[PDB]
């Protein structure tokens, strides 16, 4: 049996083929997804996934996230010098000139961190299988190069996986939607993840996939919505109580967790409550706040627009037109947001397909591909 792994910028998922259907596997915490976050506590203990995530704000200098932005990359790559500006942790150039990460004097390569994430996936998958997992199919962005694909392939080996193949994410998702046997059909893939946004235009002819165009934004994702919502919450609190939280990470850690929760609520509801008791201390100050969908949409209107232009360029570079696109599938949890769904519809001129879970589709596709190989 061959494991399929979506090693994501922000979140990872693992699925395997059970019969004629792919089964997504859930970790020891009962979650079907795992944060691609790795951190080292002051003492030197290592944390991976949710544990690291729940410390990300209080321990910024030693928490590694969005490493996938650095994997397979040279240090002087504009994409790395840009990332340095947007992340608090330290990036240093290895002896190769490759982009590395440093924490507490110990430095790691992006492939090592990925390996830490892949190790837990491996663990997660093995619980299911019973035996040990040896063979994997891991996914990479269409825009990845050899250097990036090898480094991803190398990360799998460190964790003890033989990466039989590396397939493109957009292609993987298309597999999850059954487009494998399409005679002729042009597909647009709108992937808005926790950390990156991707638009990829695919054509399938007699079952052969071609990536015609690819565009997007490396620094626009779901986390950016959370932060914009956090600033709004923080700013609204100063007004009402006069307390400024910016300097208290322990509280900011809670707000982020709370901002992450409100966002999810507002894709199924138009209102939710931000309730954070004893956030600070003339006495305790409790954070009680009401957030509505229309408000949220307003707060992150600019995050959404920024998707509109890359998708237009994608079709241009692919010499296509809304009429030409036969289907549009959504990938990324941030695609659950209705306003994202609407912006996606009046962009490609059709209702987006939402049959497959937005953030398990790639893992599922990776499974399909792996079942084929076994």
Q: Is 43 a catalytic residue?
A: no
Please state the closest distance from residue 285 (CB atom) to Na ion, in A.
38
Residue 73 labelled as part of a binding site: no
Please state the closest distance from residue 319 (CB atom) to Na ion, in A.
27
Q: Is 191 a catalytic residue?
A: yes
Residue 333 labelled as part of a binding site: yes
Q: Which of 83, 98, 154, 169 is catalytic?
A: 169
Residue 247 labelled as part of a binding site: no
Residue 11 labelled as part of a binding site: yes
Q: What is the CA radius of gyration of the chain?
A: 21
CB atoms within 10 A of CB 149: 18
Please state the closest distance from residue 11 (CB atom) to Na ion, in A.
7
Residue 297 labelled as part of a binding site: no
| Closer CB to Na ion, 9 or 272, in the complex | 9
Q: Say whether 75 sits in a helix, a strand or coil.
A: coil
Residue 63 labelled as part of a binding site: no
DSSP H helix total and E strand total for the chain: 12, 18
| Closer CB to Na ion, 8 or 371, in the complex | 8
In whole angstroms, give the CA distance from residue 214 to residue 3. 27
Q: Is 169 a catalytic residue?
A: yes
Q: Which of 191, 223, 226, 327 is catalytic?
A: 191
| Closer CB to Na ion, 155 or 255, in the complex | 155
| CA dist list (Å): 138 to 128, 208, 268, 366 | 18, 19, 32, 7
Contacting residues toward Na ion, per CB under 5 A: 8-9, 193
Please state the closest distance from residue 271 (CB atom) to Na ion, in A.
30
| Closer CB to Na ion, 115 or 279, in the complex | 115
In whole angstroms, give the CA distance from residue 148 to residue 166. 11
Report how far Cα 234 is from the mean position of its chain's Cα atoms: 25
Residue 232, H or E segment? helix 222-241
Q: 21 is written with which tokens?
A: 């259907």
Picking from 126, 98, 143, the residue whose alpha carbon sits closest to that of residue 5 is 126
| Closer CB to Na ion, 9 or 59, in the complex | 9
Please state the closest distance from residue 200 (CB atom) to Na ion, in A.
12
Q: Residue 157: which region, alpha, beta or left (left: phi > 0; alpha: psi -120 to 50)?
A: alpha
Q: Is 68 a catalytic residue?
A: yes
- Bind-site residues for ADP: 10-11, 260, 263, 267, 333, 336
- Bind-site residues: 10-11, 260, 263, 267, 333, 336
Give the residue numbers annotated as catalytic, written as ranges.
Answer: 6, 68, 169, 191
């Amino acid at each position: 049996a061959v494991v399929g792994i979506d090693l994501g910028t922000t979140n990872s998922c693992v699925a395997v083929m059970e019969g004629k259907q792919a089964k997504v596997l859930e970790n020891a915490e009962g979650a079907r997804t795992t944060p691609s976050v790795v951190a080292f506590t002051a003492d030197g203990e290592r944390l991976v996934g949710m544990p690291a995530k729940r410390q990300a704000v209080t321990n910024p200098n030693n928490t590694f996230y969005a490493t996938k932005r650095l994997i397979g990359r040279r240090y002087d790559d504009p994409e790395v010098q840009k990332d340095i500006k947007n992340v608090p942790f330290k990036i240093v150039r290895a002896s190769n000139g490759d982009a590395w990460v440093e924490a507490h004097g110990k430095l790691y390569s992006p492939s090592q961190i990925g390996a830490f994430v892949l190790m837990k996936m491996k663990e997660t998958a093995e619980n299911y299988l019973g035996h040990t997992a040896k063979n994997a199919v891991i996914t990479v962005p269409a825009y990845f190069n050899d250097s990036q694909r090898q480094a991803t392939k190398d990360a799998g080996q460190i964790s003890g996986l033989n990466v039989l193949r590396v397939i493109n994410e957009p292609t993987a998702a298309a597999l999850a939607y059954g487009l494998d046997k399409s005679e002729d059909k042009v597909i647009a893939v709108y992937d808005l993840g926790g950390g990156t946004f991707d638009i990829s235009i695919l054509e399938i002819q007699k079952g052969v996939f071609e990536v015609k165009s690819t565009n997007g934004d490396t620094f626009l994702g779901g986390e950016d919505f959370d932060q914009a919502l956090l600033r709004h919450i923080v700013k609204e609190f100063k007004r009402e109580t006069g307390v400024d939280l910016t300097k208290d990470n322990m509280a900011l850690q809670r707000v982020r967790e709370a901002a992450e929760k409100a966002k999810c609520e507002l894709s199924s509801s138009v209102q939710t409550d931000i309730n954070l008791p004893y956030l600070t201390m003339s006495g305790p100050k409790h954070l009680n706040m009401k957030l509505t969908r229309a408000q949220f949409e307003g707060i992150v209107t600019d995050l959404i627009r920024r998707t509109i232009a890359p998708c237009q360029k994608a079709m241009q570079d692919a010499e296509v037109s809304k009429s030409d696109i036969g289907e549009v599938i959504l990938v990324g949890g941030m695609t659950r947001m209705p306003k994202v769904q609407q912006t996606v519809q009046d962009l490609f001129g059709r209702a987006p397909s939402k049959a497959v879970n937005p953030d398990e589709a790639v893992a599922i596709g990776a499974a399909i591909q792996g079942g084929v190989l076994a």
